[PDB]
Amino acid sequence: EADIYQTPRYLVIGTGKKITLECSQTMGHDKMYWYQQDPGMELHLIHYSYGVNSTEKGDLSSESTVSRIRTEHFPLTLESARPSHTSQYLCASSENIGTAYEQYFGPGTRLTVTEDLKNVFPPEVAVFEPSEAEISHTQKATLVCLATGFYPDHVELSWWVNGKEVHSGVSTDPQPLKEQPALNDSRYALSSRLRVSATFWQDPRNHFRCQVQFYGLSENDEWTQDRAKPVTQIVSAEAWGRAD
C-alpha cells in the first residue's frame, strides 16, 4: 500500500552546499524516475533506475547524482548548489507488470538556490476588512490578505474561521508577485480573498484568521545579520466580525 514520499517539499539553500533530495516508494516498483521542470516549462527526465545499483541519465547536462542502494530509495543529489538548478523536482515510480502503471505522485521538491542567504525574508501578513459599500450594495463581505516582502517563493496561505480552515468562498493568486521585478532576486508578494455573507461578517463572535506558512531556513543554518533568523515559520493576521 501507501503512495510515494518526497522530502523536503520546500527548502532554501546557499550556493556551494551539498543538497540531497530524497524520495521513497512503499510500492516495490523497481523503476524510478527523477524529473525536473524549470518554471514555465515541461517535464525533463534527468535520472532513472530500473532497480538497485542501476543509475541512468536523460539529459546529459544534469549535474546531479543518484543512488539506488535500495528498492525503496532513489535519493537525488547535487554536490554544489547553483542558481541555475532553481526549479521544481519530481520523483517517479511505475508499476512492474502488465500494462505499465505509473504514479509519480511525488508532491515534488521546491528548490531555491540563493546567491548567499542574507536575501531571505519572511512574509508580512495583513488582512483588510470589507468595504461597507460592497456590503450595502452586495450584502457580501470580501476579506483580503497580503503577504509582503518575503523571499523565496515558498509559502502556503490558509484562512481559518472560528478555528476552522475554510476553502469555500476563497481564492488565492496561483502565482505570487515580484515587488522589484528589476531584481531576479526580488522579494515576493501574494494576495488572497475571502468572501462571505454580510450578516455573517457583522456578527462579532465570528473570528477570522489568515494563516501563512513560510518555509525558511533550518535552525542549524548559520545566521549573522542584525535581524531575526528567517527560519521556516508561520505568520498570521486576524480580524473580528463587526456590525458597524
Binding site: 517535464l43 512492474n96 493568486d173 480573498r193
Partner: protein, 192 residues
Amino acid sequence: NQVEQSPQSLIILEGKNCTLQCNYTVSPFSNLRWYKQDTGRGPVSLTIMTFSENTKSNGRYTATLDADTKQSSLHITASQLSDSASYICVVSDRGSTLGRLYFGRGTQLTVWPDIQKPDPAVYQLRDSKSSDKSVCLFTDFDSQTNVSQSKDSDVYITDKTVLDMRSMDFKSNSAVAWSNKSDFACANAFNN
C-alpha cells in the same frame, strides 16, 4: 520519439464538452496515457490505453486511441473549473520493463465560470489595524474581462481570481491592487 499535442493552450467555460488530440512517431506502442498535472503539483494518471480500441471512460473523461494507433483524443464532458490544468499525453515503447515514455509538451487547459447576472465594481478596503495604507478590489465582472497589469513600478495588481460560495451556489471573479500611498485612488487604478 515525437509526441505532438494540440491545442497547446486553451480556455473554455463550465458545462462545455472539450476534446484534444495527440499524434506521434514511435516504433512500437503498448501504453498511451493522459495526465492532469496541476500548478506546481505532479501529474495524474487519468487513463492508459493499449491495442484496445479508441474508447475508455473514467467519469467525465473519455480517451480515444487511433485504430492503427497514430493519434488519440481525450474527450471531457461538462467541464468544471477544477479541471483547469495542463494535460500531458505520454506514449511508451512497449515493455513494462524496457519501455520509455515520451511526454508531450501538453496543452494548458483553462476553465472560466458562467457569467450570469454580472455586476462589475471597485471597492476600497481599509486596514483591519489602523494604518494609512489600503487596497482596491475590482469584482463581479464577466470572465471575458481582462485584467491589465500595473506596469507602474510602484503599483501592484493581481490577475483575476475566482472564488466559489457553494452555500449560495455563487462564483465571482476579482482582482486586487495596492501601492505605497501618495498619488493613489481606486479610480485611476484598474484603468484599462
